[PDB]
Amino acid sequence: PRVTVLVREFEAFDNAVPELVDSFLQQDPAQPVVVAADTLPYPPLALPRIPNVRLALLQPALDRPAAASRPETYVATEFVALVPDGARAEAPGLLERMVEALRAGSARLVAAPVATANPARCLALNVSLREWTARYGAAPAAPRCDALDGDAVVLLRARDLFNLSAPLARPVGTSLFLQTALRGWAVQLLDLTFAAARQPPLATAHARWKAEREGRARRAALLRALGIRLVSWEGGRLEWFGCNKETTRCFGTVVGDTPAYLYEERWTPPCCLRALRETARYVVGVLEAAGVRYWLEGGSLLGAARHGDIIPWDYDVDLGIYLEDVGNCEQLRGAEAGSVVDERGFVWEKAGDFFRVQYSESNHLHVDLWPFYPRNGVMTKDTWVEFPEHFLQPLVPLPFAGFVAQAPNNYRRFLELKFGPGVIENPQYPN
Amino acid sequence: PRVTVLVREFEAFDNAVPELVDSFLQQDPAQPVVVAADTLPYPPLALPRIPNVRLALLQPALDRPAAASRPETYVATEFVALVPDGARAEAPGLLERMVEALRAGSARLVAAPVATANPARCLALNVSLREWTARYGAAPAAPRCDALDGDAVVLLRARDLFNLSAPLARPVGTSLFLQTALRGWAVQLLDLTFAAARQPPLATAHARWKAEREGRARRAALLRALGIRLVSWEGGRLEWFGCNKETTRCFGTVVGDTPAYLYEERWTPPCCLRALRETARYVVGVLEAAGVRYWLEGGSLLGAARHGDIIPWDYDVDLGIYLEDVGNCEQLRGAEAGSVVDERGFVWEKAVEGDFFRVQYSESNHLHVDLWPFYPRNGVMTKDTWVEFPEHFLQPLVPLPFAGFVAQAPNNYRRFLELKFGPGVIENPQYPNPALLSLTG
Amino acid sequence: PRVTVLVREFEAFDNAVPELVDSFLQQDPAQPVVVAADTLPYPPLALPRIPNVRLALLQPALDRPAAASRPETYVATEFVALVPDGARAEAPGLLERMVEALRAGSARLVAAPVATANPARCLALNVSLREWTARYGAAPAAPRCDALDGDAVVLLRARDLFNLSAPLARPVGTSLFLQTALRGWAVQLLDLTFAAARQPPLATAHARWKAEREGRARRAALLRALGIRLVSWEGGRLEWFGCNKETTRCFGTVVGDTPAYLYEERWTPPCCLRALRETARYVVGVLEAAGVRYWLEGGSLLGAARHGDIIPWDYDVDLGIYLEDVGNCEQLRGAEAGSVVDERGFVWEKAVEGDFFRVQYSESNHLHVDLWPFYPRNGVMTKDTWLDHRQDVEFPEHFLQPLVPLPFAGFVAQAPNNYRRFLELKFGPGVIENPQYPNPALLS
Amino acid sequence: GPRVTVLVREFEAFDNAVPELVDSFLQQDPAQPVVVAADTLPYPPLALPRIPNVRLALLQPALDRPAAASRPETYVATEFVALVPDGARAEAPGLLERMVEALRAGSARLVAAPVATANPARCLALNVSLREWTARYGAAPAAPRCDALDGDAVVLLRARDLFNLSAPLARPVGTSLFLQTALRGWAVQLLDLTFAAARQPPLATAHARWKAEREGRARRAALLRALGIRLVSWEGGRLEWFGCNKETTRCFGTVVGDTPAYLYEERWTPPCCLRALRETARYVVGVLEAAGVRYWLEGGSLLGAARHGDIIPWDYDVDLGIYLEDVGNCEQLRGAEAGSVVDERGFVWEKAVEGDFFRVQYSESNHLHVDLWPFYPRNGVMTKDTDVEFPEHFLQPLVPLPFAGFVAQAPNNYRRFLELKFGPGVIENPQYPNPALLSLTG
Numbered sequence A: 001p002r003v004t005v006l007v008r009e010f011e012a013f014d015n016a017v018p019e020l021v022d023s024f025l026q027q028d029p030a031q032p033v034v035v036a037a038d039t040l041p042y043p044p045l046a047l048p049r050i051p052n053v054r055l056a057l058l059q060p061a062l063d064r065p066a067a068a069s070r071p072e073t074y075v076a077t078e079f080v081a082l083v084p085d086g087a088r089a090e091a092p093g094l095l096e097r098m099v100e101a102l103r104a105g106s107a108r109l110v111a112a113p114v115a116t117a118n119p120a121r122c123l124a125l126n127v128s129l130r131e132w133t134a135r136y137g138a139a140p141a142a143p144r145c146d147a148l149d150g151d152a153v154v155l156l157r158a159r160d161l162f163n164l165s166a167p168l169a170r171p172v173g174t175s176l177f178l179q180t181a182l183r184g185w186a187v188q189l190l191d192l193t194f195a196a197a198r199q200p201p202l203a204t205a206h207a208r209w210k211a212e213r214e215g216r217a218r219r220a221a222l223l224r225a226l227g228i229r230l231v232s233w234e235g236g237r238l239e240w241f242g243c244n245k246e247t248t249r250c251f252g253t254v255v256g257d258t259p260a261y262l263y264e265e266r267w268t269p270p271c272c273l274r275a276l277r278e279t280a281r282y283v284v285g286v287l288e289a290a291g292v293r294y295w296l297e298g299g300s301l302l303g304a305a306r307h308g309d310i311i312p313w314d315y316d317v318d319l320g321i322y323l324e325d326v327g328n329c330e331q332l333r334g335a336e337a338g339s340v341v342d343e344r345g346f347v348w349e350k351a352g353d354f355f356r357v358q359y360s361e362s363n364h365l366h367v368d369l370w371p372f373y374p375r376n377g378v379m380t381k382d383t384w385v386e387f388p389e390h391f392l393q394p395l396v397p398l399p400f401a402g403f404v405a406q407a408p409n410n411y412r413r414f415l416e417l418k419f420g421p422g423v424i425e426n427p428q429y430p431n
Numbered sequence B: 001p002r003v004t005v006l007v008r009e010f011e012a013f014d015n016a017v018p019e020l021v022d023s024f025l026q027q028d029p030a031q032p033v034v035v036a037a038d039t040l041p042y043p044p045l046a047l048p049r050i051p052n053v054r055l056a057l058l059q060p061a062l063d064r065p066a067a068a069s070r071p072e073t074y075v076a077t078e079f080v081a082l083v084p085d086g087a088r089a090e091a092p093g094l095l096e097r098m099v100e101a102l103r104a105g106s107a108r109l110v111a112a113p114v115a116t117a118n119p120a121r122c123l124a125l126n127v128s129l130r131e132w133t134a135r136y137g138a139a140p141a142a143p144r145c146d147a148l149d150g151d152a153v154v155l156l157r158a159r160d161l162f163n164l165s166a167p168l169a170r171p172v173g174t175s176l177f178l179q180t181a182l183r184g185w186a187v188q189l190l191d192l193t194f195a196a197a198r199q200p201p202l203a204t205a206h207a208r209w210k211a212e213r214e215g216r217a218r219r220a221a222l223l224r225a226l227g228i229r230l231v232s233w234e235g236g237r238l239e240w241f242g243c244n245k246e247t248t249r250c251f252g253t254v255v256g257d258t259p260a261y262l263y264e265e266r267w268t269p270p271c272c273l274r275a276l277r278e279t280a281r282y283v284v285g286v287l288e289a290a291g292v293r294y295w296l297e298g299g300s301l302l303g304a305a306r307h308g309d310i311i312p313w314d315y316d317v318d319l320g321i322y323l324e325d326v327g328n329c330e331q332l333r334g335a336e337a338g339s340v341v342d343e344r345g346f347v348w349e350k351a352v353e354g355d356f357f358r359v360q361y362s363e364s365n366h367l368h369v370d371l372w373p374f375y376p377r378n379g380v381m382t383k384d385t386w387v388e389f390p391e392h393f394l395q396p397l398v399p400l401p402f403a404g405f406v407a408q409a410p411n412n413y414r415r416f417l418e419l420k421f422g423p424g425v426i427e428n429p430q431y432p433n434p435a436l437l438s439l440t441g
Numbered sequence C: 001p002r003v004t005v006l007v008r009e010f011e012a013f014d015n016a017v018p019e020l021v022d023s024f025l026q027q028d029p030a031q032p033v034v035v036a037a038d039t040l041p042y043p044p045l046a047l048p049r050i051p052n053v054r055l056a057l058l059q060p061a062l063d064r065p066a067a068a069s070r071p072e073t074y075v076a077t078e079f080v081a082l083v084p085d086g087a088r089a090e091a092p093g094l095l096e097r098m099v100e101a102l103r104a105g106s107a108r109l110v111a112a113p114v115a116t117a118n119p120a121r122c123l124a125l126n127v128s129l130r131e132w133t134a135r136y137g138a139a140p141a142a143p144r145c146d147a148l149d150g151d152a153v154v155l156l157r158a159r160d161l162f163n164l165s166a167p168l169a170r171p172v173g174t175s176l177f178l179q180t181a182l183r184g185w186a187v188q189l190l191d192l193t194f195a196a197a198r199q200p201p202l203a204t205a206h207a208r209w210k211a212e213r214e215g216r217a218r219r220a221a222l223l224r225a226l227g228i229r230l231v232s233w234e235g236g237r238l239e240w241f242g243c244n245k246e247t248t249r250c251f252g253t254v255v256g257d258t259p260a261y262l263y264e265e266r267w268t269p270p271c272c273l274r275a276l277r278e279t280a281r282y283v284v285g286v287l288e289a290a291g292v293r294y295w296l297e298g299g300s301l302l303g304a305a306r307h308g309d310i311i312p313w314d315y316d317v318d319l320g321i322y323l324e325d326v327g328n329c330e331q332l333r334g335a336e337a338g339s340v341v342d343e344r345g346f347v348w349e350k351a352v353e354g355d356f357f358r359v360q361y362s363e364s365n366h367l368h369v370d371l372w373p374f375y376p377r378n379g380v381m382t383k384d385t386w387l388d389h390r391q392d393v394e395f396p397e398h399f400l401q402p403l404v405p406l407p408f409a410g411f412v413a414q415a416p417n418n419y420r421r422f423l424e425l426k427f428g429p430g431v432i433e434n435p436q437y438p439n440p441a442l443l444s
Numbered sequence D: 001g002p003r004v005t006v007l008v009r010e011f012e013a014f015d016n017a018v019p020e021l022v023d024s025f026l027q028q029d030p031a032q033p034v035v036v037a038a039d040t041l042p043y044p045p046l047a048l049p050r051i052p053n054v055r056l057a058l059l060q061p062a063l064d065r066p067a068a069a070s071r072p073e074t075y076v077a078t079e080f081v082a083l084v085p086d087g088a089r090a091e092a093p094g095l096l097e098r099m100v101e102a103l104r105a106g107s108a109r110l111v112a113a114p115v116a117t118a119n120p121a122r123c124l125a126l127n128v129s130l131r132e133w134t135a136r137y138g139a140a141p142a143a144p145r146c147d148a149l150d151g152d153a154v155v156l157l158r159a160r161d162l163f164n165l166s167a168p169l170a171r172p173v174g175t176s177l178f179l180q181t182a183l184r185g186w187a188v189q190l191l192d193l194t195f196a197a198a199r200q201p202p203l204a205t206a207h208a209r210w211k212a213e214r215e216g217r218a219r220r221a222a223l224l225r226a227l228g229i230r231l232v233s234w235e236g237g238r239l240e241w242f243g244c245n246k247e248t249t250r251c252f253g254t255v256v257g258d259t260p261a262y263l264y265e266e267r268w269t270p271p272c273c274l275r276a277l278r279e280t281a282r283y284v285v286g287v288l289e290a291a292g293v294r295y296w297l298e299g300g301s302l303l304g305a306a307r308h309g310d311i312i313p314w315d316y317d318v319d320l321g322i323y324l325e326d327v328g329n330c331e332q333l334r335g336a337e338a339g340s341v342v343d344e345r346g347f348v349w350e351k352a353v354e355g356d357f358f359r360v361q362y363s364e365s366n367h368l369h370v371d372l373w374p375f376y377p378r379n380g381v382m383t384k385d386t387d388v389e390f391p392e393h394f395l396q397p398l399v400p401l402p403f404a405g406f407v408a409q410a411p412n413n414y415r416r417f418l419e420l421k422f423g424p425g426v427i428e429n430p431q432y433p434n435p436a437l438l439s440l441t442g
């Protein structure tokens, strides 16, 4: 029943780690304690310089072996307890009680909230790497949950913790449960409680605001490194960690009509789809304002017919327009002379049969506009397939990407025209 | 098969790695080959789908075990051959030649240049972590070297490569030899040449420009992460990677009075020393032009007397001045009414705590020269806040080299220093003591 | 099951500890390993400087806390395995199998021999601190023993090993089992074998020779530090670690008639008793050949009457002689002129107290026989100077006419007739049947 | 409840006043905790009161005791410990809590009160340098705030501070305690309180004192050797040595891979070894000057001379160059080619294993040495046909240079000479040993 206390979540500029360590040492003078950090914390932690208390520095160093930054090599015991800063040991035998709870139960992780201002609460959590998304919500089976929000001591076996790909990546409260929920592991929120530090850290408003800003930066760098572009919550709140109007798009130049994310066995990053939807809405608005006849085309019409949205692995939007109405829209006659950046940041280009509207100068997610003209009662272009004009007389309202778009009438027939029978019900899933 | 080809230095957007892997397989279909990358290379490498060729993705991922990001997981042979993009295997029996050479020699690394436009050259290298410096130079004992500049296949034992802390940190050409040289290991540049790829990568000026921009960015991040603040060639062609006029100073606020670098078992970043020398020179220039009597004080006078420079673990400069001369200098007169940024960015302030003056390098970089006003009563120099000393030490002042210029010092400064610090202090430096610091705090 | 490997038995000048530690690291790269030494070994051990392999220096040091020299603070695991130099991990998971047997069995220690030229064997062991003796013999209930002889990996719980007073005193093979056997613990000798080092230490006869010497010196210092004077084996072989003719006696000058070892709740060291018996045997042989009438006196007679030997907490021997006979013995004649060293190294001298003689084992070892001269006044034996003990009294001469044989200290000695009445006259009724310390007003 | 445990460690079993000491403290408070600590059971018996608050702590391994029994903290349940020397007696009541009150209100982690004996404690300064194996004592400039005490004092400090040291009760406590506390930068405050002397003071006769001092001196010498204190000095003088000498082996023995054992221990060269090196250098130089052998400081010896006029503190030998053509002028050198020569003052002169150089050892047992490297002009260059080769004008002429306490000869413009051999800026950038580096590079 030997447990190593492992401290990872603290701020060098303001912490209660010395009190934390001394509290556990008072219950057992030989208590193994590992404080982990990326670089040597300054001001000095001034931990007891005793063999059972050790500081593990996790970044590479010119004068250290590979083993010196691998944390399992500091942990000899069967069980490990992640303790956040602000916790202290008061009553004895709490770690042993958590161990017997873990062995008695069926959850590979047990947790005991710390009585801070934000004690841990259960949460549900669903990770979809394919969609670059993590969704949180209220946990139906509490005290059994997928993740925790707030402060808690977490206990698990060392073999379980250190076989994870990133066991001590910060913030631990986000990184750990992303990895354990993806593996189908559960955490049991026990009824035990650890007391708070008698002199808690981040006592002033400046200190707390400084810590929250650097914590938000670490959380953003973590999610970007691990492929989470979107955190969403039950209730609707969204947290974005991908591209936007002032950045480049997430994947860059496609070759051979296969974007990079497909080889990573993922679909389109949700931030990229968001920009495409917003550009589709903007362009349609501009076109309808100028009185230009447009209709959904290609995979955009297909996605609209299938589920009213962009096909989740597509990376552009295709609209058809009447060649005759091109002149009615200022952005487009300007696009003939050269690239036009309008007042809202969108970039209209002609390149090439067609026009292309990019989300911004830096973010090259685009809507392609393909002009057709009626010559035979058939709609046709001039460089390269054609379709009869009666599919556009009239056009029908069709939900797409958050707004009501225009589609050819009888568009399921139109889609079997362009793609073959059964296209809507048989999606061509990437493999 | 005893060697595993490992490819780490290449660019996703333009490379010849397929030709590389193919060239080694054309000589032995069973040859073990590992292409290592942080993320899946795009466009697809389309490497042969055989068991002995593996793509090693070294970044941690939510869906993978810890072992997947450890490069030793992918190598099961005794040696590793680090092959740069642009190389190719043509003459059979070349890796076995490098094995025989390394076995018979005393160097732990052997290398063969590749016949590109930039073939490997032999270099000397010493790494001082205390001084945060990588000193390069021409290799006196060539073809036994400390580092290589250029393209080469480097062969060493897998157990050696993967015991390094950062075995595949990029650029490998920089990261590997910083680690091996610090360990006292040599690389032996053999009389063997690998051919270049028949379609070499980065052939256009544009491709090269993008590769070089990314490569320099990776080098800069690598040196900062590893605590190399200064790179030099033959003591010149200095390359800096630390603080400057526009940044914070490297160590920030001292709580000790023991700056952070002492707990890291190093000395003052050269980076910071340079700013201190710059500021001391500028302040002395200002004091002399304004007619302010100054002299080197405390550890600055001690360092000047010892070796004519700042003590390499100190972090400021101290000067004494006559108090009655303060009025002669506009920055100092302005410093008593509040903080003044002068025309060259230096910040002159009057620390109300100690009744002294402080001149910062810049508004953001708080390396400073301190000015201690003394005034004579009864022929003793004294001040009213806190050692006092007889004025005859200042009558007259003598020249003394310090920090790249000639400074003023008290006469009989060795006596002066001995009365302030004790006898023999010039000869017995209080060298930093990590063990003791670990004990006292 | 987590097991820390702990290495204590090795020589700095010649060892295979690097091979040992690497052999366990090849089975588990994070295997916790503690090498313990008294001082920093030179030449350098050059262990892997990785966090799971640590060097524990048990010396005091000005710049270290108390914890730095307490080995338990280096061991965080439930179990610890003492591994000797010259051993090697080859099979996977032997430590796990040893843990399993310890859990399943009743012994607090389990052991696996090492395939050296001298694998561990199973031994019985009784420790008697009161008698300063460790008695070894063949194991009656093997493979369950009190002690081992030879090289073995010994696995036990850290809480058990580090609760011992001297868990890592060298030689561990002697020190550990002296402590565990005294506590009634057993060591189970398992049917598992660790391999020997591929390049074993002490490869040359010279290197071996200096190693056997410094081990012998360490063992001797260990037994003296722990108060083991005598070690015996099943064949009857004895090794001594105390008194001899060439040294000082073990205990020094006695105040209050109560020697220092009694307050340590120990009896007379077995080496001091041996010297006392060989001195008694010699002195009696000299007096008989010289024609001096002697009889067992005081506590020596009492011990003879009880069990034919020196009282086990006594520290001298007392004999009475007719004073008219002193002139018959050359040593006694010389002793009145001064201290005499005789043909066998014994020292004869007239004492510095009450007109009696004293015979020392040697010049350096002052264990002695005291000779008390008596003369008959009127059928009553008496002296002119008397020490202030209840045992120093006049007595009737008829007790000496005639003397009777009585076994004492391995030989037949002369005793007063009716020695029971003689002893009760000098000590009070029932003295033979009621043993007590020389002075129970201080210690009983 | 009492907050101080009296601890008695400094006493002699054959002659002490410990029973009086214990009784005096129990007479102010019968429940006062008192601990007498000893390595073995003191004989003759102490016969201390058989009450629970009086305990004999035996600090010896024993076959029939648990680990806790030999640990002194086992016996202390109070926050504070008062180390009381034998010869003290408690008379004025409440002296211990005045000392507790002083300690809490002050800023020294130790407070002390002298005992009114023949040798009352006096305040001292103490600098401990493990790197130089030296304890430097002197008068205390900021008394009554000290680093160490000399004499008899009751010393009070927190139990957790005392029992956290490596050797809290090592004898003599008056030496071991302040070596450890001064190294930690702790201070002792000599309070203006005084304890009374025992009514019947111990060691009252000259013979008893002689025995007591002999054993104490023996304990002190063993303590400084075990703790690595080779030299004790008072005001920089009155040197007291505890290392090697002319009749012993050198401290670090045989060197493996030019890395002497002291470097791995994160220290520099022992001061006894440096002293012998300076003696041998001065002697060899004097012999060479009297015999007419031209010599010059070479290598690291010259480097130390130019830098600070002494052996570099982590070097362990001295190197001199000589003209080969002058070897015949020296008797000891002439004999050195034949075989090893012990000269009239015990120094040993040898021609080397190979590499053609001469070696002069301090003595037959102590192998600290000066090396002599013979050169000869071949053109204008100095060479040994088996050290760097350098132009001969650096020797035309030689210059005086302070070194190791005398004046030695050096190559002219030794600064240029040194950078030709070692590299630019060598005099100015010394790099003391790097044990962490050493740990990485064997």
Ligand SMILES: *[C@@H]1O[C@H](CO)[C@@H](O)[C@H](O)[C@H]1NC(C)=O
Binding pocket: A124, A125, A126, A135, A136, A137
């Ligand atoms: C994760 O998956 C389940 C179905 O397997 C789903 O019902 C649940 O809502 C998902 N998690 C969240 C937080 O929505």
Ligand SMILES: *[C@@H]1O[C@H](CO)[C@@H](O)[C@H](O)[C@H]1NC(C)=O
Binding pocket: A072, A158, A159, A160, A162, A163
């Ligand atoms: C991963 O788990 C396996 C099996 O429990 C174990 O052998 C290994 O040591 C673990 N990895 C660690 C703890 O880094």
Ligand SMILES: *[C@@H]1O[C@H](CO)[C@@H](O)[C@H](O)[C@H]1NC(C)=O
Binding pocket: A063, A064, A065, B159, B160, B163, C047, C048, C049, C050, D439, D440
């Ligand atoms: C790993 O590197 C360290 C250097 O710090 C060394 O102590 C250790 O022996 C190395 N292990 C191997 C197998 O090279």
Ligand SMILES: *[C@@H]1O[C@H](CO)[C@@H](O)[C@H](O)[C@H]1NC(C)=O
Binding pocket: C124, C125, C126, C135, C136, C137, C138
């Ligand atoms: C140990 O003591 C037991 C119990 O009296 C006894 O039977 C046995 O013979 C003794 N063994 C030895 C080796 O003395």
Ligand SMILES: *[C@@H]1O[C@H](CO)[C@@H](O)[C@H](O)[C@H]1NC(C)=O
Binding pocket: B421, B422, D125, D126, D127, D136, D137, D138, D139, D235, D236
């Ligand atoms: C102790 O060191 C201080 C500071 O280095 C010095 O001023 C003082 O003279 C030293 N004292 C002794 C006795 O060496």
Ligand SMILES: [Ba+2]
Binding pocket: A298, A299, A314
């Ligand atoms: Ba499409």
Ligand SMILES: [Ba+2]
Binding pocket: B298, B299
């Ligand atoms: Ba200073």
Ligand SMILES: [Ba+2]
Binding pocket: C298, C299, C314, C316
């Ligand atoms: Ba008797």
Ligand SMILES: [Ba+2]
Binding pocket: D299, D300, D315
């Ligand atoms: Ba040298």
Ligand SMILES: [Zn+2]
Binding pocket: A242, A243, A244, A249, A250, A269, A270, A271, A272, A273
């Ligand atoms: Zn995106």
Ligand SMILES: [Zn+2]
Binding pocket: B242, B243, B244, B249, B250, B251, B269, B270, B271, B272, B273
């Ligand atoms: Zn800097």
Ligand SMILES: [Zn+2]
Binding pocket: C242, C243, C244, C249, C250, C269, C270, C271, C272, C273
């Ligand atoms: Zn004896």
Ligand SMILES: [Zn+2]
Binding pocket: D243, D244, D245, D250, D251, D252, D270, D271, D272, D273, D274
């Ligand atoms: Zn020495």
